[PDB]
Amino acid sequence: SHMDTPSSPSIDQVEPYSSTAQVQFDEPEATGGVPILKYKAEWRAVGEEVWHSKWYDAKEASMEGIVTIVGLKPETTYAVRLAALNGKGLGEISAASEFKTQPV
C-alpha cells in the first residue's frame, strides 16, 4: 500500500580536476515506487569528519550522467557518495567512491 524511498545510485567513476570533479553515476534500480526528484552529493576529504553536500536536479543529472562537485582543494583525496530523493524522502546512499584532486 506504500511507496518507499529510492534504492542507491551507483558511482561509475570520478574525473577530478583541481577544485572540481565530475561524478559519473547510474540511476537507482528502483525509484521506490514514485519518481526521482533530486540527487544529493555528499563529499569529504579523507581523514576529516565534516561532510559537504549539494542538491542537483534529477533531469539534468540523469541526462548528462554526471553531477559536478565544487569548492575542492587541490592535491587532496576525497570520498563521495550519492543519494536520490523522491516524494517519500532520501533513498539509500551509494557506496563511497574515493578520488584525488589534481595538483595546480
- Amino acid at site 43: W
Nearer to Na ion, 12 or 64 (CB): 12
CB of 8 to Na ion, least distance (A): 12
Binding site for Na ion (CB under 5 A): 12, 26
Cell of 38: 533530486
CB of 35 to Na ion, least distance (A): 20
What gap in Å lies between CA 28 and CA 50, rounded to an integer? 26
Nearer to Na ion, 61 or 72 (CB): 61
CB of 91 to Na ion, least distance (A): 17
Q: How far is CA 104 from CA 16, 46, 70, 73, in A?
A: 12, 19, 15, 10
Nearer to Na ion, 12 or 98 (CB): 12
Dmax over CA atoms of the chain, in Å, equals 54
